[PDB]
């Protein structure tokens, strides 16, 4: 199995207990 982040992707940082979202990102172009 290969997981290749070579296309747009999302990242979400979630508080386990409260589900507060501490940070969220969509990377459409890492060279910005």
């Amino acid at each position: 199995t290969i997981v290749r982040f070579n296309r747009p992707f999302l990242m979400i940082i979630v508080d386990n207990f409260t589900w507060s979202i501490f940070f969220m990102s969509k990377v459409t172009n890492p060279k910005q």
């Binding site: 199995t1 290969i2 997981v3 290749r4 982040f5 070579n6 296309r7 747009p8 992707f9 999302l10 990242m11 979400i12 940082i13 979630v14 508080d15 386990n16 207990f17 409260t18 589900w19 507060s20 979202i21 501490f22 940070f23 969220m24 990102s25 969509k26 990377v27 459409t28 172009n29 890492p30 060279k31 910005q32």
Partner: protein, 334 residues
């Protein structure tokens, strides 16, 4: 009940940020923004107050005002931690025109619940006031956010500020010897070369969602870092399914799996925003007009919000990640 509010708020805001420019990178901290607005609500009354709390997606029939503030106080304490694996910090502050009289209940509540002090500030010396605030944010974010405040009205009465900083090591770091320039497909037909980190024979939580045409993994304390990788041209479809229900199914469906190869770019990105339009769309309206009731701050309805700004930065590298964000709420006299 608080969990449903937090996710609804984060995803509502996310979609609103995307709508303004659907192909741009997005980076933001939902909790930085909600903490700043909840802090403001400590001084709000009547419709100004109810609009703020409803805009943060709380339902005031399940959760009382006191329970909301208690949740932010607890959250603030969970986001100040240090270990060999992690550095987390979160702070709040108020910068206030020196001669402005504040109610003792407000400054007591602000320190106890939000950890906020009050800094006497001469906003009429705009350059000096901006430096004072930007330096506070620079200090809290370890130099990662340094220009949160660009323009600042010389007639400002107060600025409420939140910052958050998060630095973490990967459980399994990438070897920089295995980072190589590789294609990143902005679309099927548009691609650039980026430094692409790689790891082999990894065992990590994994879920292939054939229904949503995406793969979810977790790399890495007590926070879960979810990576969601839509198939090519499926990002818009995945965004359309984001919700508490979908996030729950992701977490429920993860299972450990040996992955042959993992490729993740090395990169740093930044975004900044003015959130007035979005907050008005979420129904937080009276706070921006002359009907604003922030009389819990001063004892008179003599303040209203002028500007809400947010900036956030994300850095991903072989050893781990660094994330930072800050929010400022600028307040004028009325």
């Amino acid at each position: 009940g608080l969990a449903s509010a937090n996710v609804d708020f984060a995803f509502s805001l996310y979609k609103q940020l995307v709508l303004k420019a659907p192909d741009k990178n997005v980076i933001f901290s939902p909790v930085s923004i909600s903490t700043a607005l909840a802090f403001l609500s400590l001084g709000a009354h009547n419709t100004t107050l109810t609009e703020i709390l409803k805009g943060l997606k709380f339902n005031l029939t399940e959760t009382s005002e006191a329970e909301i503030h208690q949740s932010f106080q607890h959250l603030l304490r969970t986001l100040n931690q240090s270990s060999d694996e992690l550095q987390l910090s979160m702070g709040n502050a108020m910068f206030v025109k020196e001669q402005l009289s504040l109610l003792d209940r407000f400054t007591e509540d602000a320190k106890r619940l939000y950890g906020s002090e009050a800094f006497a500030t001469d906003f009429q010396d705009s350059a000096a006031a901006k430096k004072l605030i930007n330096d506070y944010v620079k200090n809290g974010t370890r130099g990662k956010i340094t220009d949160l405040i660009k323009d600042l009205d010389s007639q400002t009465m107060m600025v409420l500020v939140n910052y958050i900083f998060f630095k973490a090591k990967f459980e399994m770091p990438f070897d920089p010897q295995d980072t190589h320039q590789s294609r990143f497909y902005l679309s099927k037909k548009k691609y650039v070369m980026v430094p692409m980190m790689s790891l082999h024979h990894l065992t990590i939580p994994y879920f292939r969602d054939e229904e949503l045409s995406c793969t979810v993994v977790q790399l890495n304390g007590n926070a879960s870092a979810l990576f969601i990788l839509p198939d090519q041209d499926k990002m818009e479809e995945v965004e359309a399914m984001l919700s508490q229900e979908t996030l729950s199914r992701f977490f429920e469906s993860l299972e450990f799996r040996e992955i042959g190869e993992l490729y993740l770019p090395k990169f740093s990105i930044s975004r900044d925003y003015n959130l007035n339009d979005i907050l008005l769309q979420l129904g937080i309206e009276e706070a921006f007009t002359s009907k604003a009731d922030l009389s819990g701050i001063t004892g008179a309805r003599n303040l209203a919000v002028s500007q809400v700004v947010h900036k956030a930065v994300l850095d991903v590298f072989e050893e781990g990640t660094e994330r930072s964000a800050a929010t400022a709420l600028e307040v004028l006299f009325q």
